[PDB]
Amino acid sequence: FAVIAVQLFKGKFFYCTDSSKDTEKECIGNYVDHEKNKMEVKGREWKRHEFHYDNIIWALLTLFTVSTGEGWPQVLQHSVDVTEEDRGPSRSNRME
Amino acid sequence: INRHNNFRSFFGSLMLLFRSATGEAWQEIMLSCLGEKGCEPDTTAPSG
Amino acid sequence: LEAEKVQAAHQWREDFASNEVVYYNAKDDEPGSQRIKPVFIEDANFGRQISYQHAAVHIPTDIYEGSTIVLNELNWTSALDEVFKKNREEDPSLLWQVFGSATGLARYYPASPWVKIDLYDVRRRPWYIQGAASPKDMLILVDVSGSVSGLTLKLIRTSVSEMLETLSDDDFVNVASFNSNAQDVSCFQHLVQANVRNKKVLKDAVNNITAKGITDYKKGFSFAFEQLLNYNVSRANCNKIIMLFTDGGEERAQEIFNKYNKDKKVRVFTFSVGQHNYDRGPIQWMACENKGYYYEIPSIGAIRINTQEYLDVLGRPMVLAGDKAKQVQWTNVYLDALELGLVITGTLPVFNITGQFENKTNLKNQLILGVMGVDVSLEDIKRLTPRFTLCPNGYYFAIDPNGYVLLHPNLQPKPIGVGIPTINSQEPVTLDFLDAELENDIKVEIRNKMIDGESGEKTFRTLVKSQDERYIDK
Amino acid sequence: TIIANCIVLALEQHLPEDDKTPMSRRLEKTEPYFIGIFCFEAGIKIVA
Amino acid sequence: DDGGFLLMANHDDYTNQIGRFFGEIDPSLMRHLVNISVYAFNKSYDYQSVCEPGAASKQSCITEQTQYFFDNDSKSFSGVLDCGNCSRIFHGEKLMNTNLIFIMVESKGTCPCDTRLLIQAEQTSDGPNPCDMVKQPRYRKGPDVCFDNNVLEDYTDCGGVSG
Amino acid sequence: VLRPLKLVSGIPSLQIVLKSIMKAMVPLLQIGLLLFFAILMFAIIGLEFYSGKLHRACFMNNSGILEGFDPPHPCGVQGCPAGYECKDWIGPNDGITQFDNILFAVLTVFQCITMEGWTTVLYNTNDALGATWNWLYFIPLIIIG
Amino acid sequence: RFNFNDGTPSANFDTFPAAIMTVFQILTGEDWNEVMYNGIRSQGGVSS
Ligand SMILES: *[C@@H]1O[C@H](CO)[C@@H](O[C@@H]2O[C@H](CO)[C@@H](O[C@@H]3O[C@H](CO)[C@@H](O[C@@H]4O[C@H](CO)[C@@H](O)[C@H](O)[C@H]4NC(C)=O)[C@H](O)[C@H]3NC(C)=O)[C@H](O)[C@H]2NC(C)=O)[C@H](O)[C@H]1NC(C)=O
Ligand SMILES: *[C@@H]1O[C@H](CO)[C@@H](O[C@@H]2O[C@H](CO)[C@@H](O)[C@H](O)[C@H]2NC(C)=O)[C@H](O)[C@H]1NC(C)=O
Ligand SMILES: *[C@@H]1O[C@H](CO)[C@@H](O[C@@H]2O[C@H](CO)[C@@H](O)[C@H](O)[C@H]2NC(C)=O)[C@H](O)[C@H]1NC(C)=O
Ligand SMILES: *[C@@H]1O[C@H](CO)[C@@H](O[C@@H]2O[C@H](CO)[C@@H](O)[C@H](O)[C@H]2NC(C)=O)[C@H](O)[C@H]1NC(C)=O
Numbered sequence A: 001f002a003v004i005a006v007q008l009f010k011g012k013f014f015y016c017t018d019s020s021k022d023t024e025k026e027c028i029g030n031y032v033d034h035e036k037n038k039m040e041v042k043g044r045e046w047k048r049h050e051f052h053y054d055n056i057i058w059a060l061l062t063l064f065t066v067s068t069g070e071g072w073p074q075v076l077q078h079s080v081d082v083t084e085e086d087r088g089p090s091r092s093n094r095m096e
Numbered sequence B: 001i002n003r004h005n006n007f008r009s010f011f012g013s014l015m016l017l018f019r020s021a022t023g024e025a026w027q028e029i030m031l032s033c034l035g036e037k038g039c040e041p042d043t044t045a046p047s048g
Numbered sequence C: 001l002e003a004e005k006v007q008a009a010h011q012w013r014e015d016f017a018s019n020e021v022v023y024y025n026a027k028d029d030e031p032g033s034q035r036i037k038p039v040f041i042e043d044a045n046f047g048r049q050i051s052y053q054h055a056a057v058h059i060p061t062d063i064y065e066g067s068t069i070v071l072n073e074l075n076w077t078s079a080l081d082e083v084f085k086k087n088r089e090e091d092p093s094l095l096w097q098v099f100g101s102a103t104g105l106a107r108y109y110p111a112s113p114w115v116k117i118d119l120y121d122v123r124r125r126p127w128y129i130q131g132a133a134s135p136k137d138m139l140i141l142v143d144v145s146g147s148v149s150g151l152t153l154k155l156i157r158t159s160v161s162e163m164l165e166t167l168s169d170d171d172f173v174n175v176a177s178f179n180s181n182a183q184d185v186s187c188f189q190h191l192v193q194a195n196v197r198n199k200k201v202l203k204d205a206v207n208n209i210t211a212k213g214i215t216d217y218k219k220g221f222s223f224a225f226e227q228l229l230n231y232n233v234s235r236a237n238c239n240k241i242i243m244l245f246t247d248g249g250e251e252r253a254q255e256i257f258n259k260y261n262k263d264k265k266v267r268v269f270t271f272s273v274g275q276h277n278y279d280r281g282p283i284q285w286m287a288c289e290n291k292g293y294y295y296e297i298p299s300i301g302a303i304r305i306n307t308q309e310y311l312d313v314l315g316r317p318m319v320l321a322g323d324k325a326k327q328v329q330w331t332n333v334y335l336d337a338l339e340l341g342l343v344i345t346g347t348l349p350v351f352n353i354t355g356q357f358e359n360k361t362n363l364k365n366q367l368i369l370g371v372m373g374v375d376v377s378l379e380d381i382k383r384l385t386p387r388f389t390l391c392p393n394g395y396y397f398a399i400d401p402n403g404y405v406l407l408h409p410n411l412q413p414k415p416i417g418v419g420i421p422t423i424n425s426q427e428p429v430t431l432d433f434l435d436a437e438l439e440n441d442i443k444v445e446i447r448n449k450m451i452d453g454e455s456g457e458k459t460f461r462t463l464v465k466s467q468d469e470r471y472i473d474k
Numbered sequence D: 001t002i003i004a005n006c007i008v009l010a011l012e013q014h015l016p017e018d019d020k021t022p023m024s025r026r027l028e029k030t031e032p033y034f035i036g037i038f039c040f041e042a043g044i045k046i047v048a
Numbered sequence E: 001d002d003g004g005f006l007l008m009a010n011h012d013d014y015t016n017q018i019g020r021f022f023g024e025i026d027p028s029l030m031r032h033l034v035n036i037s038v039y040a041f042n043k044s045y046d047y048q049s050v051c052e053p054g055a056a057s058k059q060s061c062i063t064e065q066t067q068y069f070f071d072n073d074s075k076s077f078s079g080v081l082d083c084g085n086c087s088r089i090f091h092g093e094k095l096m097n098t099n100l101i102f103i104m105v106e107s108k109g110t111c112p113c114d115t116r117l118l119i120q121a122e123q124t125s126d127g128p129n130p131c132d133m134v135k136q137p138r139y140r141k142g143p144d145v146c147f148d149n150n151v152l153e154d155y156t157d158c159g160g161v162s163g
Numbered sequence F: 001v002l003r004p005l006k007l008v009s010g011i012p013s014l015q016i017v018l019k020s021i022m023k024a025m026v027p028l029l030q031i032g033l034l035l036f037f038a039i040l041m042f043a044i045i046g047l048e049f050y051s052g053k054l055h056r057a058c059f060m061n062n063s064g065i066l067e068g069f070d071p072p073h074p075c076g077v078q079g080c081p082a083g084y085e086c087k088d089w090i091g092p093n094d095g096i097t098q099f100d101n102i103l104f105a106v107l108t109v110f111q112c113i114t115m116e117g118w119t120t121v122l123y124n125t126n127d128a129l130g131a132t133w134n135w136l137y138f139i140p141l142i143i144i145g
Numbered sequence G: 001r002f003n004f005n006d007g008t009p010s011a012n013f014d015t016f017p018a019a020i021m022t023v024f025q026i027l028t029g030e031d032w033n034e035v036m037y038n039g040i041r042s043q044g045g046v047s048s
């Protein structure tokens, strides 16, 4: 299952701190954050989801955490938002 | 790893372990105690 | 003329490792660029410390300096610093000269440091907007069906409110909503002049809408096209555009478009607002089947940049007009961003004319490079009208073709108030002649003779107000 | 017939504040047929 | 004076409030004076005026103004003021070569009435209503230069295919 | 929504399978009783100690009579640690997770015995009444319940 | 009914796949209380 899970979400668990940017080239600089009804200037970071499937060890750890039953809805949401090899997530893109 | 959940004391660590045993956010704790986190200021043992 | 020629001879480098771009960045104390430390000698005619040695550059927060787009713009614009000086030596009493790029950066001379958070964008300024396109007859369509309730509705309210900030006194606007029945949102029922007072009525009305019902694009667009064929009221007789603020549907509404705008004389700009998975196909089709554009607004951060970009589409017929569409325009009196008081700005667009010698590219040449502007303070105008050779009761005043006073004793360096301030200056100082002093039957006739333009004299008896707002005398 | 009714129920989409997808309006038209079929099968077992 | 501001008094209680609008202290006589066409007002709006924020720093808002002046060139005025189950007779003469008026009325205690105050000051407002201003708008002349619907336009780039 | 359940009556094999499922679950009923009493036992204990003790929180931040930590810090018998002041608070989960009456207490206890967010309830009463005796109520509740 | 002012949660009952995913998540008993909170505040809050 971990080997199959790698081929499904390998490299696709990346995201920029602001939803506007989709790749790492654009995800650089500063942006205005409009969370909690308050503006703030924050740097743009091309981050990765905490639990991913980049290789087989990370896939095994993610599947173990899912099997324990902890945080698996968030991993499911991240997997559903998966779009492409090196692009930021799109909401409910691949619900299958 | 905050004022509610930390390994600072024996009973705090025991409570953290019980919380993980019931499976609350044990992966979040694992991530929060992973890497190059800032260290508690040591009041004693002066250094340069 | 220099900006058009210099930009045409640009090679579009892709790397700036060796030949770094050297410039002075305002609001400062990254690879591919080199900074400049200026001297900043004090000088009159300005309220701050300036420098005639070079020109400062302002790059908005949301735009990263050091990318390929900005760095290329920062190279061919470095040839404007010589022309900036040549204008100043030829006219020592010259205020800010600024080139607002379509990229988003503004390069102004002389160099002064920039003035919480900074939300300045040169493309949203009234002097940029008036030169980027011609007046319009915008009519905003808002989808208030049930599916837009929640986050989408509060995004549509902010998107419409931020869209009214791009309209001026020469533009005419109305907001209409539809959910199985199309109706006006406010007390207007036709296109209004979109001044400061009228834009607040639409803002309050659009902030009080609720979402319920079923979408009906045929009835929503029939109401929109009927509103743009009124001709019973004062209009702009210019760009007629329909702004559809929706989320997503499945109706192409074909039969309406081949009925009303068979010749495609009305543009349709469609916006998809919110986080959803509805089909955007019909929204994308009617957008560019009617010479328009399609925009997406998924979050608050995308509201500001997407409600300003429709002026690129409206600027296409202005670019194709060539040298005929290059006339200097002057804005309404407004407060300068760099704290200089009340100013008016000249305006001339810049066209991107690479390869026009052989006439072969014609692909990105229908967009403007930006807008050139020069500031004129009202104190400069007041110096040309001396007032000490006549009694205190005598004075000068100048009037806009819209009736506003460019110069008047009753004009003050404060924003004009609208409504009552209820709590839990980007608007211009547009004060009418009939509001600057006491209105009269003769005043209306006299003002109307100044709007169209014709000399004359008239002596009469009028009751005038005193300096302290306590007495009136004839 | 029951399988078809299950599929029809599975294709419904719910929208807030009395809103209907155009597909859901078409699906709303199939209910009388199912109701009539079930009424027939109930009548065949009540009185026969 | 020309504006109804208290410049003289008799009770020695009005003299403390010298230089005050007469309508703020004697609304009954002041309102009748406007009615008999000795003082004539027009109001006006001040759009560049700072106002104290209300319940939903300082912000600008429209404050309606009002000013009073002599209407008719008649000099002497006499009449009877009616306020309800009471009668007060007044005589008014205007000082020559001056913007002053002299009035004499019976004391306010004689008539047990108290009408609402007629205040002449900076009162915050929101008028005029723009809902009916647009029906008969002021004359204006817009630009005669229009640029739209050029046959050479591309418009081959939507917002969807590019994205 | 019971229309899919007509497939069970259509196929008697599914009827047999469902009958077996139900038959295997009958002896659990007494266990369920032993569960309910436990839920009844602790809820009452939570009603006599935690009733109305989770209605204040640290809010004062001289920023608009609002704000505070994203996991809001309920007030108690000691006060806020810093330039915050105790103010009326709707409740932890918008007023849902509390021991106001027996129904709210029963719901909170049932949520706790499922080990879903019971630590949040424990920490809410830790800074509202002190952390001395609260552990004596929740640790047995997980162990027994 | 799950589109609030801050956005609709991923665990909603709008479409059949989303409803079945939410029901499966509740069956596994992980973060079911957070779904219950949304389901309560959608019917009129803690009051009704
Ligand atoms: C005035 O008009 C002229 C032409 O009318 C215009 O000059 C043109 O500028 C563009 C740059 O925006 C050049 O584009 C070339 O072609 C593609 C553009 O897409 C680039 O290749 C990659 O394309 C992908 C996506 O298409 C993109 O993400 C990526 O960044 C691109 N680059 C890569 C992968 O390295 C080419 O690289 C790019 N050429 C070069 C040298 O980079 C056109 O070639 C230009 N045309 C002419 C005739 O010069 C000019 O920009 C207009 N003025 C202004 C101010 O914009
Ligand atoms: C774009 O940048 C390049 C590099 O800075 C400029 O090219 C140089 O111009 C200087 C001055 O004429 C020459 O001496 C160099 O030989 C040029 N090439 C280099 C440095 O590699 C170019 O002028 C800039 N474009 C514009 C329009 O100013
Ligand atoms: C105002 O516009 C409307 C259409 O938007 C037109 O109304 C006309 O009203 C007059 C008198 O009732 C009649 O001629 C017709 O009933 C209407 N149509 C036309 C074509 O005249 C008209 O254009 C304007 N109304 C006027 C001028 O009274
Ligand atoms: C200012 O006061 C004048 C005179 O008191 C008023 O003008 C009115 O309209 C015409 C124009 O002069 C006069 O014939 C009337 O007698 C005036 N009074 C009334 C009641 O109509 C008016 O109050 C003010 N003028 C304005 C606002 O233009």
Ligand SMILES: CC(C)CCC[C@@H](C)[C@H]1CC[C@H]2[C@@H]3CC=C4C[C@@H](O)CC[C@]4(C)[C@H]3CC[C@]12C
Binding pocket: A095, A096, G017, G020, G024
């Ligand atoms: C009953 C429990 C065990 C779950 C059984 C799995 C079935 C019933 C569920 C789980 C995942 C679901 C799928 C999730 C997402 C999609 C993509 C969407 O565009 C069409 C429906 C489709 C394809 C769903 C159909 C129903 C589905 C296949």
Ligand SMILES: [Ca+2]
Binding pocket: A069, A070, B023, B024, F115, F116, F117, G029, G030, G031
């Ligand atoms: Ca859990």
Ligand SMILES: [Ca+2]
Binding pocket: C145, C146, C147, C148, C214, C215, D019
């Ligand atoms: Ca809809």
